[PDB]
Amino acid sequence: SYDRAITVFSPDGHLFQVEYAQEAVKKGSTAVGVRGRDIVVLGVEKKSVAKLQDERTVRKICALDDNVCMAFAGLTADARIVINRARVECQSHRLTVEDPVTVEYITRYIASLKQRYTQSNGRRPFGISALIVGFDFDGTPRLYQTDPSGTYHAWKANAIGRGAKSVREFLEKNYTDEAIETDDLTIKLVIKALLEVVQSGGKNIELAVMRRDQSLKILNPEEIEKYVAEIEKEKEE
Amino acid sequence: NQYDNDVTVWSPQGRIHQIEYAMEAVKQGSATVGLKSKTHAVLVALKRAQSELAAHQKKILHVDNHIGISIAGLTADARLLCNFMRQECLDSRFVFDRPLPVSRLVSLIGSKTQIPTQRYGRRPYGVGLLIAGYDDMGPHIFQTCPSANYFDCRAMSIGARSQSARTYLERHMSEFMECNLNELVKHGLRALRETLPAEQDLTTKNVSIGIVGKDLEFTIYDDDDVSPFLEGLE
Amino acid sequence: SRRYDSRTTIFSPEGRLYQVEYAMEAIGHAGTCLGILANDGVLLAAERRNIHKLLDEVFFSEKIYKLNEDMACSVAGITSDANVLTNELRLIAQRYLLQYQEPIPCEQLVTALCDIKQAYTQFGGKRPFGVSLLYIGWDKHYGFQLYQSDPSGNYGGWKATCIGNNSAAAVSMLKQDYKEGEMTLKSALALAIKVLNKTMDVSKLSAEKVEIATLTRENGKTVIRVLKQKEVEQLIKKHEEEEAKAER
Amino acid sequence: DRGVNTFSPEGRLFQVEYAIEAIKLGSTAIGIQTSEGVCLAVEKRITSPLMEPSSIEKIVEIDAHIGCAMSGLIADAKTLIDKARVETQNHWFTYNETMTVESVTQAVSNLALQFGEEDADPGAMSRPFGVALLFGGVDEKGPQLFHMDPSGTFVQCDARAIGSASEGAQSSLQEVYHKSMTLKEAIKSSLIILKQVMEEKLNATNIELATVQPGQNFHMFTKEELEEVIKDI
Amino acid sequence: GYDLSASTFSPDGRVFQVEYAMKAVENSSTAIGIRCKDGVVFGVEKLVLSKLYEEGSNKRLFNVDRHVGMAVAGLLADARSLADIAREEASNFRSNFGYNIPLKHLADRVAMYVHAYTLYSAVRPFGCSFMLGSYSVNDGAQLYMIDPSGVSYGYWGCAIGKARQAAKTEIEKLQMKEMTCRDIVKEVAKIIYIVHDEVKDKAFELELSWVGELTNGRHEIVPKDIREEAEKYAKESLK
Amino acid sequence: RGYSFSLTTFSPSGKLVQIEYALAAVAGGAPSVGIKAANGVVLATEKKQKSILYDERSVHKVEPITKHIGLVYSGMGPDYRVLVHRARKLAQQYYLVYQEPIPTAQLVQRVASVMQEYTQSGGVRPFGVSLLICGWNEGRPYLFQSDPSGAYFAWKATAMGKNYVNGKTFLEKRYNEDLELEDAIHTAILTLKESFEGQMTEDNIEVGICNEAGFRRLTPTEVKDYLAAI
Amino acid sequence: SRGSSAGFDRHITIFSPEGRLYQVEYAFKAINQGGLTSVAVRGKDCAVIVTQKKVPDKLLDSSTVTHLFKITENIGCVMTGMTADSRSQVQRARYEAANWKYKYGYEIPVDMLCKRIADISQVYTQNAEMRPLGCCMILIGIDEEQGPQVYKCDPAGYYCGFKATAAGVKQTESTSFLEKKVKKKFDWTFEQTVETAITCLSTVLSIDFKPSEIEVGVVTVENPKFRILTEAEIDAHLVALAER
Amino acid sequence: SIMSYNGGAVMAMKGKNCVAIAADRRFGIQAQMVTTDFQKIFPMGDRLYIGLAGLATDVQTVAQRLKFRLNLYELKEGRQIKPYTLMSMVANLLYEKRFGPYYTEPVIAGLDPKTFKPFICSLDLIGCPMVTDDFVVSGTCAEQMYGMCESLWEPNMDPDHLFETISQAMLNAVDRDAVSGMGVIVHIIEKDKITTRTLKARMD
Ligand SMILES: [Cl-]
Ligand SMILES: [Cl-]
Ligand SMILES: [Cl-]
Ligand SMILES: [Cl-]
Ligand SMILES: [Cl-]
Ligand SMILES: [Cl-]
Ligand SMILES: [Cl-]
Ligand SMILES: [Cl-]
Ligand SMILES: [Cl-]
Ligand SMILES: [Cl-]
Ligand SMILES: [Cl-]
Ligand SMILES: [Cl-]
Ligand SMILES: [Cl-]
Ligand SMILES: [Cl-]
Ligand SMILES: [Cl-]
Ligand SMILES: [Cl-]
Ligand SMILES: [Cl-]
Ligand SMILES: [K+]
Ligand SMILES: [Mg+2]
Ligand SMILES: [Mg+2]
């Protein structure tokens, strides 16, 4: 079996394989997460459009358990591996603790999986970041982010993938108690945030919500373009 | 150049650069001195302190009641080797109910440390040891190297500027056999002091001492416990 | 030995996996292979490369593989690699049937193989498999289905798609002619020939030069059939007759 | 390109030297040991107002009597921290006593050079850890602060900075430290020094501080307790 | 670069990594073995690199079985490991077959082990050559020499290390077939003093061992007084 | 322990050059011919046999796998011996389970699968051989080629080794569907004569046949007889 | 092509652009490093192996300098090329033959032993991590049906049986000498087999031997056990040749 | 006895250009009947069936695992498996568990997929194959079944006469066995059709 050391240090303390995995993430479709007051929302760009595609089969938003879901940006095949590993783990937790995972527990687990693939022989790092959202047993809403290095943090809102710099700038100016006071406004904040980067708005924004206890709902194109117009016409005034 | 990255690559002059390079790890450690009389084996070591507020690195380690070591080079490799030596000593007392003879333990270090010098992707141990022991053949000072070679010594110094210590030790070695313990440690300290910049002196913060002999299990002296030995370097 | 390791499973400086990309170039040169979804079934149509006169014609197809009772596939790329993968697909499908006593849903079979391909890009120091696959099938969850997978371990569902030589061109023609929700197997067959005729531009299209398989449902049972040459000639005839109308 | 266990002509392992350079990319952390207890203080380094500051943890409890501050590649620290935690619990299980700060630091440091690509199990460590650690606690030797870097070298320090501004911070520590210094003085000293060296204006959310005292278990300062200490400074 | 692995032939059919290992042996000081009427005698020019070393440190003469001596040149850690291999082989032989290993068979077995380190990128060749000597009433005196490629031959006289050729030309002057071990020790000491370059390397110890009728087939260090008599004879012969 | 990385990889244009280079070893090997007649199969090959000092009967290029299946090759002989041994072993494993001789196509599939492994597996090069495999089963003759990539093809007739391209066009203007075996043997030997150089004896070619009775090498005296016309 | 090279195709056993294996080619050059030549010839009644015996050093025990080896009581061998490689191959052959007898209850045929060693050598041409052995093995024995046998295998893993053959520096010349001689002989078969072998060797080297400068080994239909000729025995042949 | 734990009986019988295979329908655990429609005969092809008596868990496992192997065989080969080759496949499968066997003893009945020639055989629990030209039996009432078959079977029976014979052999044999019965199912296999019947039968 293959034992080559793949992720190694360079002069100045760089881990080049990890930096390169991070470049793969920067070329993924834009993903956005906002933690609301009693809701969490994930929105993600495109990726390709293409009329002949079966839309169902390429989603970048994914249930991990009833109370935790995730979006990713980067190498989609890599993301699938992470997602399935996390899904298995959620069931082990339930098995041995008889509670669902906290969002932090499963984030911590995904992050340490990723970190291991930066320090084990024979393997390259995963080329993905993840936005992980849900609710803890006591109702507290949560948004976490992981990256290829295994680092993770909690966020009020965030973006990953292409144009994440500019979307994050927008969330910084626009994430207020007012902007998330209600469910529709929280959803609108995700869409406005994408509508800044999303090439042919929009059209190709996929979007999903999780409510306290209520489990992942994906919005359909009919439900989305309701919000799109309801915001596009408000910005004329 | 093409010959210096792998311990399995002989150079065209019949050298192994990786082993030579591992030996530089020991030349850059802080100096330690080992010497012996008819009855005792002594180790003396200089401790390098990182900053003024750091304690000073341990240089001397207990192996068994009859054996201790002084280290120079990579500390993590020193501990790995020290743990090997400890285990070999415990095994011998478990099996035979007597101390492992010092020369036999040193043979085991040679055999153990030679192995990674001959396999691809392994590396030499980057540590040299001075080994003080006492057994049926009396006191001993042995030296081990990253090359896996080892030496039975009247006295020895390794580490930075140890050439001065070696010289002092040659100058006075004909005295050592007949020295009492105090004279012998004094000699060890004088040799170690030769390694220091003209400014600087032996202090209770930077000197560590290890002693074993006929009447005495391997004992380590640090900090306030070295003051008896430092006073009356007269 | 580090000197001789070409390092097939590492990132490049742009976050790229060169062996995967290079494998995708291999595929681009292989025989053109298309898949079309209809309301009453699904088809595969592929360019044959085994066309030399002295070849012997011993199996029921060249590049169409039955996977289990309800599914088939075709391939573009390294043939021997495709034989390893199609053998693995059959194994997975029987493991599923053993365990659950029901056929593997189409997307589940595709995903299981794509996880093997993904592994080959992440660990093991091996070259990836030089294959893209088109998968056709029926299951009780989503009925008639068409999937595409490639050496990265990525896949997707499609209503019509193409891999191998002149794919980009083929997909433009499909984009233009395909009627979502309104295709029959008969019209998809017509479109398939139309597409191959344009994309085998070296040269004049012959039944000996293509293979078509269809997948349909009859009396609660999946039927998977490779069209006989008489039927392929008849379809080519009808396409040429159709272009006779084209101006007046 | 060369193997991960290659010595340079100066007798150092390239990978370890490079891991030592990665420590300089970390936030600054400070440890001070007094006769009344040890304190640990760390710059959080908030990169966006959207990030939750409490999700940054660069000081962690090892056991009730031992905390740990880290700098460098933080993801690498997790397995070291977990190893420390497991070791102290094993010691407790086996011996029914608390493990010394020194012993914990030693056990963690034995992981240091355990990397390489053809001695070991199917996918063991490919490289060293890009982390430095300050272990601060109280055992029967009294209060204690130990430093450890990627070489596996560890040592007791009366006061020590690590991370980006550690030269700097270490100078100021030489200046202010004295053996008879109180814990409350050490707390103030380390926040004054962090305040100098941090790019951002020190406040009660972009730092952490913890203490361990002979009296009292590992204690992370609250926002409220930080503000009270920040008033003087 | 055709000279970095023992698993690579050069275009002329050479294995440079074995040749380079041989160069390590040829940099070492000289060891000699001489077979005679009633046994085998070994001598080594043992350079003293520090006056701080104990007399007897870094022995280059080893007992590998009670009836077998080994004399080495080249990288000493490699040589010691080979002495361990040889010991183990002699031991296993006795456990399996129930008698003392024949010298020739021990030489062949260890040479195959040396040979195994000349085929692969995974390992490097041993940087040592060594002689094996024994005596018994049944087999007579036997002296074998093994080099880093793993070749093994028997000899009447042999030298290894850096004054190899000079040593051989002196050995050739002896009618060793008709001499006893007691006569030959003095001649071994003599030859070591002849080939020793006293200008280039200052201090050496003479190391002497033998096996023969006179030791009852046991490999033993030459006794101190006989060694000193031999040295005195050698030194005075140099005059 | 062994190298765990592939020695065959994709080039920037999508080629596995080690396999191409293996194919060049095949193209440089001695010529081999296979013709499927109506009632059998003939395999024929040239002995690259210098010296009268060779004992021509000491090693064979035309080899039996089973009672009903046989092989020949172009390319590297020692590589061929590996594959002969594996084919034989694969045939036996099949027979132990199924109690029926392995169908020619099933044998070709399993052998080709082995050749594929050597294009991807750690620390090995591909086989520098192409095989022609003949057999008789389901009352019918079969001729297959298996190449260094692990690709295989069913032929009516073909050639491999030096000058194979011409050999192929020579067969194209000479093979018919309804040809008998005795005739096919003649055209096989004529096809080798095209690219021979040296004058043909029964000692420097080898011929194997496959029919309802099974597979066997022709004997020197039998080859002598076919050569008298040629 | 015509001596082209890509990547590591001169360092490890991968194909060159012409489909060559340079490392295997180079192993054949290694056979000549030793500077020795060997000859083997078979007749109806016996098979003989002759090689040079060079003892440049007076201080060698010349009884230990040989390239003739007994593999079993009935199979002999001459080795040509790198000495330590050759010895290893001898051990392996001895092991393969002993193992054959244990499993199958009869002596390994010479052809099968040669084949097995050749097959083992083949692995070193296809796997990258070790080199081929730079040596060549010639085996003799009596087969009950086929009579005396001479087989040779090489670092490429090729093997063949022969009427006569050679190995080492003057292999080509020996091959020509032997070819010219068999054509002359009826039923293309050697009859004066020890004489032909020694003459061939002496011609191609231009030496005219003393009985201490060659070694001779034999197997015969009447006496199938492998036998090494003594000096005196060899001398009787050298003298019978001197006088015609 | 492990094989009487569930009880049960199967048999197969040859006629002119047809074969028959039959089984009782009880699934019981020692004395207790649990169900009366338990499947013991499984199609391995259009004209090829395997009947398994013995331990009910192994009946099901062997049927399922055999099916796994057969599907892969058929996908890989050109073709539908031959009766004799199925027997060998089954033999090999059972003998792999030589030192910890499945507790089932199958019978096979079919027609060759090309020739349509009749085939029947049975195997013991470790895979010893036995082909016959008349009949085979397996289960807790084998002696009863042998008595009925030896007395009633004749060569070259047509489908209607074969049906009556196998039915009477089964019904009367199981009616002397406490742990077999609760119904009998019969498949008659011909070139052009399968005929499947359940029999009026004692339910005690
Ligand atoms: Cl893992
Ligand atoms: Cl990002
Ligand atoms: Cl040091
Ligand atoms: Cl260190
Ligand atoms: Cl040294
Ligand atoms: Cl030193
Ligand atoms: Cl199926
Ligand atoms: Cl299925
Ligand atoms: Cl630092
Ligand atoms: Cl030498
Ligand atoms: Cl490897
Ligand atoms: Cl074989
Ligand atoms: Cl067979
Ligand atoms: Cl034959
Ligand atoms: Cl035996
Ligand atoms: Cl003659
Ligand atoms: Cl199974
Ligand atoms: K090789
Ligand atoms: Mg009943
Ligand atoms: Mg009842």
UniProtKB/Swiss-Prot annotation, chain D:
Entry-annotated residues carrying Phosphothreonine: T47
Induction field: Up-regulated in colon cancer cell lines. Up-regulated in fetal Down syndrome (DS) brain (at protein level). May be the target of the transcriptional activator NFE2L2.
UniProt keyword annotation of Ubl conjugation present: no
Domain of life per record: Eukaryota
UniProt keyword terms in alphabetical order: Acetylation, Cytoplasm, Glycoprotein, Nucleus, Phosphoprotein, Proteasome
A biological process from GO: proteasome-mediated ubiquitin-dependent protein catabolic process
Pfam families membership: Proteasome, Proteasome_A_N
Glycosylation sites: S190
Spans traversing the lipid bilayer: none
PROSITE patterns per the UniProt record, alphabetical: PROTEASOME_ALPHA_1, PROTEASOME_ALPHA_2
Modified residues (Phosphoserine): S8, S48, S55
CDD domains attached to this UniProt entry: proteasome_alpha_type_5 (cd03753)
GO cellular component, as recorded: cytoplasm; cytosol; extracellular exosome; extracellular region; ficolin-1-rich granule lumen; nucleoplasm; nucleus; proteasome complex
Localization per record: Cytoplasm; Nucleus
Tissue occurrence: Expressed in fetal brain (at protein level).
Entry keyword Metal-binding: no
Stated family: Belongs to the peptidase T1A family.
Quaternary structure note: The 26S proteasome consists of a 20S proteasome core and two 19S regulatory subunits. The 20S proteasome core is a barrel-shaped complex made of 28 subunits that are arranged in four stacked rings. The two outer rings are each formed by seven alpha subunits, and the two inner rings are formed by seven beta subunits. The proteolytic activity is exerted by three beta-subunits PSMB5, PSMB6 and PSMB7. PSMA5 interacts directly with the PSMG1-PSMG2 heterodimer which promotes 20S proteasome assembly.
Protein name per its UniProtKB record: Proteasome subunit alpha type-5
Organism encoding this protein: Homo sapiens
Gene from which this protein is expressed: PSMA5
From Swiss-Prot, chain E:
Name of the molecule in the record: Proteasome subunit alpha type-3
Keywords carried by this UniProt record: Acetylation, Cytoplasm, Host-virus interaction, Nucleus, Phosphoprotein, Proteasome
Molecular function as annotated in GO: ubiquitin protein ligase binding
Functional note: Component of the 20S core proteasome complex involved in the proteolytic degradation of most intracellular proteins. This complex plays numerous essential roles within the cell by associating with different regulatory particles. Associated with two 19S regulatory particles, forms the 26S proteasome and thus participates in the ATP-dependent degradation of ubiquitinated proteins.
Gene3D superfamilies: Glutamine Phosphoribosylpyrophosphate, subunit 1, domain 1 (3.60.20.10)
Modified residues (N6-acetyllysine): K51, K200, K224
GO biological process: proteasome-mediated ubiquitin-dependent protein catabolic process
Residues recorded as bearing Phosphoserine in the entry: S237
Gene expressing this chain: PSMA3
UniProt-annotated location(s): Cytoplasm; Nucleus
Main location, first listed in the record: cytoplasm
A Gene Ontology term for the protein's cellular component: extracellular exosome
From Swiss-Prot, chain F:
Alphabetized Pfam families for the sequence: Proteasome (PF00227), Proteasome_A_N (PF10584)
Main subcellular localisation: cytoplasm
Result when mutating L107V: In a colorectal cancer sample; somatic mutation
Gene responsible for this protein: PSMA2
Classification via PROSITE patterns: PROTEASOME_ALPHA_1, PROTEASOME_ALPHA_2
InterPro entries, alphabetized: Ntn_hydrolases_N, Proteasome_alpha, Proteasome_alpha-type, Proteasome_asu_N, Proteasome_sua/b
UniProt keyword annotations, A-Z: Acetylation, Cytoplasm, Nucleus, Phosphoprotein, Proteasome
GO cellular component: cytoplasm; cytosol; extracellular exosome; extracellular region; ficolin-1-rich granule lumen; nucleoplasm; nucleus; P-body
GO BP field: proteasome-mediated ubiquitin-dependent protein catabolic process; response to virus
Processing and modification events after translation: Phosphorylated on tyrosine residues; which may be important for nuclear import.
Family label: Belongs to the peptidase T1A family.
Location of this chain's protein in the cell: Cytoplasm; Nucleus
Residues bearing the modification N6-acetyllysine: K67, K168
Highest taxon, organism lineage: Eukaryota
Residues spanning the signal sequence: none
Modified residues (Phosphotyrosine): Y3, Y21, Y73, Y118
Organism lineage string: Eukaryota, Metazoa, Chordata, Craniata, Vertebrata
Record flagged with keyword Phosphoprotein: yes
CDD domains given in the database record: proteasome_alpha_type_2 (cd03750)
Coiled coil regions in record: none
Stated role: Component of the 20S core proteasome complex involved in the proteolytic degradation of most intracellular proteins. This complex plays numerous essential roles within the cell by associating with different regulatory particles. Associated with two 19S regulatory particles, forms the 26S proteasome and thus participates in the ATP-dependent degradation of ubiquitinated proteins.
Protein name: Proteasome subunit alpha type-2
Phosphoserine sites (modified residues): S4, S11, S13
UniProtKB/Swiss-Prot annotation, chain G:
Glycosylation site residues: S4
Main location: cytoplasm
Keywords: Acetylation, Cytoplasm, Glycoprotein, Nucleus, Phosphoprotein, Proteasome
Subcellular location(s) per record: Cytoplasm; Nucleus
Gene Ontology terms describing biological process: positive regulation of canonical NF-kappaB signal transduction; proteasome-mediated ubiquitin-dependent protein catabolic process; proteolysis involved in protein catabolic process; regulation of inflammatory response
GO MF annotation terms: endopeptidase activity; NF-kappaB binding; purine ribonucleoside triphosphate binding; RNA binding
Superkingdom per UniProt: Eukaryota
GO (cellular component) term, any one: proteasome core complex, alpha-subunit complex
PTM-bearing positions, type Phosphoserine: S16, S62, S63
Signal peptide annotation: none
Stretches of the chain forming a coiled coil according to its record: none
Any Pfam family: Proteasome_A_N
Residues with the N6-acetyllysine modification: K101, K103
Sites bearing Phosphotyrosine, chain numbering: Y158
Subunit architecture: The 26S proteasome consists of a 20S proteasome core and two 19S regulatory subunits. The 20S proteasome core is a barrel-shaped complex made of 28 subunits that are arranged in four stacked rings. The two outer rings are each formed by seven alpha subunits, and the two inner rings are formed by seven beta subunits. The proteolytic activity is exerted by three beta-subunits PSMB5, PSMB6 and PSMB7. Interacts with ALKBH4.
Family: Belongs to the peptidase T1A family.
The protein's name: Proteasome subunit alpha type-6
Gene: PSMA6
